[PDB]
Paper text:
We focused our attention on human RAD51, an ATP-dependent recombinase crucial for homologous recombination (HR) and for error-free repair of DNA double-strand breaks. We therefore explored the possibility of using a more stable orthologue as a surrogate and focused our efforts on archeal RadA from Pyrococcus furiosus, a protein that was already structurally characterised and is closely related to human RAD51. Here, we describe the complete process of generating robust, RAD51-like surrogate systems from this archeal protein via two distinct approaches: by stepwise mutation of the surface of the RadA to humanise the BRC4 binding area (HumRadA series of mutants) and by generating an archeal/human chimera (ChimRAD51) in which all of the BRC4 binding part of RAD51 is stabilised by parts of RadA.
The structure of HumRadA2 also highlighted the need to introduce further mutations at the back of the Phe pocket (particularly V232Y216) in order to force I169M158 and K221M210 into the same conformation as observed in the HsRAD51:BRC4 complex. Proper humanisation of the Phe pocket also required the removal of an insertion that lies just before V232216 (residues L226–P231). Overall, the structures of the humanised RadA proteins are very similar to each other, and significant differences can only be seen in loops that are involved in either crystal packing, or are mobile and poorly defined.
Numbering used by the authors: 108 to 226, 232 to 286, 301 to 349
The structure:
């Protein structure tokens, strides 16, 4: 992984992303359940804690959970298989459930208070859209749903830039999922076979089209 970025754990996925995930930016990963999107989030929550030589930023994590995504048992396994102390890794993941889209937005707006006293380098939102989709139903509420989501993405981008944090969010295709303003780096995941998952990058403004295969292992993800 390159200077100032966080390695995903997979050398081929890092290459596809131009050297790993960036701070001061939003990486948005699309896929169905089983595609590896949440496995990648769990892996990043450990990788960011590593020193720069090993692909991290010695940073803490904030995890905003909108649908029971976070598995501390998985973090413990990944940490153990990457030579880290699992209890220390968990102590540096600030977990917060978001009960609705308003609460999800407020959690982001209030997050920087805890960032002056500890060095955070990663904010995960898993998932970005589940509350927005369940709360704003039909054509009569669609414009408001997209405006609210765009405002949330602007808040995340501001936080990312002010505190030098990588923002990593998950999503699902449906064109319900496309916004008028492109606030993120979009990565599309799909499930393969034999432990493999495939990532595709198709419309990045400063990265060419590409694809990468990675594996789900006891180390989280790797080639």
């Amino acid at each position: 992984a390159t200077i100032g970025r966080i390695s995903t754990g997979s050398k081929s996925l890092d290459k596809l992303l131009g050297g790993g995930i960036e701070t001061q930016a939003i990486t948005e990963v699309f896929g169905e359940f089983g595609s590896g999107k949440t496995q990648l989030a769990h892996t990043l929550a450990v990788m960011v804690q590593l020193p720069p030589e090993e692909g991290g930023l010695n940073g803490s994590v904030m995890w905003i959970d909108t649908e029971n995504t976070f598995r501390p048992e998985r973090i413990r396994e990944i940490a153990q298989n990457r030579g880290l102390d699992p209890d220390e890794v968990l102590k540096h993941i600030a977990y917060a459930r978001a009960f609705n889209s308003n609460h999800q937005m407020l959690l982001v707006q209030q997050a920087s208070a805890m960032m002056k006293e500890s060095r955070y380098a990663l904010l995960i939102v898993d998932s970005l859209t589940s509350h927005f989709r369940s709360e704003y139903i039909g054509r009569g509420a669609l414009a408001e749903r997209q405006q609210k989501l765009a405002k949330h993405l602007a808040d995340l981008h501001r936080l990312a830039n002010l505190y030098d944090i990588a923002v990593f969010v998950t999503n699902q295709v449906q064109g319900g999922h496309i916004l008028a303003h492109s606030a993120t780096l979009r990565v599309y995941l799909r499930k393969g076979k034999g432990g493999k998952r495939i990532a595709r990058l198709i419309d990045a403004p400063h990265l060419p089209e590409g694809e990468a295969v990675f594996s789900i292992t006891e180390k989280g993800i790797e080639d």
